[PDB]
């Protein structure tokens, strides 16, 4: 059973480098080329390079030359050849390099070459940013001032890094809830909103609380959302 297991997600500052590991098992590591590819938001896949573990020979994408350094650790016991670790170090990082990085390997086809990738690592998210960790401010999206359908929510603003999780009434409210994907603001901080639709007739009887969790800052907020106080 061929398996490729990558290191975890990371935040990097512009100008730094990231070294991603790919721990391979289930076959003779010296006998197959390991490739690397990234999936870039709004731009798609970009091949990074390959490494042939036997001698460490490499080939890198021409437009990335200088930015990529691939290495490996081989088993030193000839009794135990069916594992290895491949590394891809990517330097000169900028926010444009925020992407999901994959180690990949060909399958069983002996004539198709090394680019049809049967086996994929699980991916490594790399976020390149100069921002510092920060918990979110949670503000109410108050139901409009009937008996019909009302919308209400929580605005989760100015946090870094992802992710935030949102529940309603400690998980008791799930129908009609939409928690939007975060947007990156010009400040370098993320923001999202979570909303729910409910019967208008319930606004005086039922309490609605959004439960916001931002583990990177160990921030936990419970915000009660109610009609705004009017004259």
């Amino acid at each position: 059973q061929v398996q490729l297991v990558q290191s975890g997600a990371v935040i990097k500052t512009p100008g730094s480098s990231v070294k991603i590991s790919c721990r391979a098992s289930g076959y003779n590591f010296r006998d197959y080329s390991i490739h690397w590819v990234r999936l870039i938001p709004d731009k798609g896949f970009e091949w990074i390079g390959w490494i042939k573990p036997l001698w460490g020979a490499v080939s890198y994408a021409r437009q990335l030359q200088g930015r990529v350094s691939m290495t490996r650790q081989l088993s030193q016991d000839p009794d135990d050849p069916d594992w290895g670790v491949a590394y891809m170090e990517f330097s000169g990082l900028t926010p444009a390099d925020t992407a999901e990085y994959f180690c990949v390997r060909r399958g069983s086809c002996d004539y198709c070459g090394d680019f049809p990738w049967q086996y994929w690592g699980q991916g490594t998210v790399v976020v390149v940013s100069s921002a510092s960790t920060k918990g979110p401010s949670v503000f109410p999206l108050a139901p409009s001032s009937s008996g019909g359908t009302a919308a209400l929510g929580c605005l989760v603003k100015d946090y870094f890094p992802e992710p935030v999780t949102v529940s309603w009434n400690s998980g008791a409210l799930t129908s009609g809830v939409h928690t939007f994907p975060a947007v990156l603001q010009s400040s370098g901080l993320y923001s999202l909103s979570s909303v729910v639709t409910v019967p208008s007739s319930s606004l005086g009887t039922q309490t609605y609380i959004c439960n916001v969790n931002h583990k990177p800052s160990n921030t936990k907020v419970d915000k009660k959302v109610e009609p705004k106080s009017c004259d």
Binding site: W120, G123, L141, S145
Partner: protein, 209 residues
């Protein structure tokens, strides 16, 4: 270098129908590879050597073509098949074709939310417009502040297609300084969508209940 051009960008079909995806190569005579990427899932090899199915790939996936013109056909597609499909030759990739679920047109319910007093104390005003449970995903949201059309100061976010009712929801957030917010009265979100015979506007007046 090779350029691979995929079409259509988005294909909208129902389970049980047949999907045809196209990938055109700038150079003829190389074999074609196809991958599936479900939302949030690791990419999966589907087809190699133009028509060969990879491990575990059911026979309803058929890779075909030759020369420069290549096709992926998904016969009697399954709900698990809604995904983005990519073609590849060597280091070169298509930009993907998304298969999404077709359903009847549904106009969005639209809601507008003023900034909270709590936030305003901080010097910033976020105004939010919600478009709920609509199909298809294409929508136009225009912010107006005392009827002045806004540009450059809003951001949108769209949910994944709903796994049960195949709709989308969308938020647009307008960000203003407190000073700018207090200079004007009428805050409006104007929504254009195929399900609306004419655009719908939701608005509030600053300082008014």
């Amino acid at each position: 270098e090779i350029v691979l051009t995929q079409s259509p960008g988005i294909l909208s079909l129902s389970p049980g129908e047949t999907a045809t995806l196209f990938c055109k190569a700038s150079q003829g005579g190389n074999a074609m590879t196809w991958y599936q990427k479900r939302r949030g899932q690791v990419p999966r090899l589907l087809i190699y050597d133009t028509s060969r199915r990879a491990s575990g790939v059911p026979d309803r996936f058929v890779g075909s073509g030759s020369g420069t013109d290549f096709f992926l056909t998904i016969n009697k597609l399954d709900r698990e098949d809604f995904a983005v499909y990519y073609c590849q030759q060597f280091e070169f990739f298509g930009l993907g074709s998304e298969l999404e679920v077709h359903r009847t047109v549904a106009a969005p319910s639209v809601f507008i939310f003023p900034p909270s007093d709590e936030q305003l104390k901080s010097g910033t005003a976020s105004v939010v417009c919600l478009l709920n449970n609509f199909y298809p995903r294409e929508a136009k949201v225009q912010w107006k502040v005392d009827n002045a059309l806004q540009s450059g100061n809003s951001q949108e976010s769209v949910t994944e297609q709903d796994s049960k009712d195949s709709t989308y929801s969308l938020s647009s957030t307008l960000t203003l300084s407190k000073a700018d917010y207090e200079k004007h009265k009428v805050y409006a979100c104007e929504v254009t969508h195929q399900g609306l015979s004419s655009p719908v506007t939701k608005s509030f007046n600053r300082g008014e209940c």
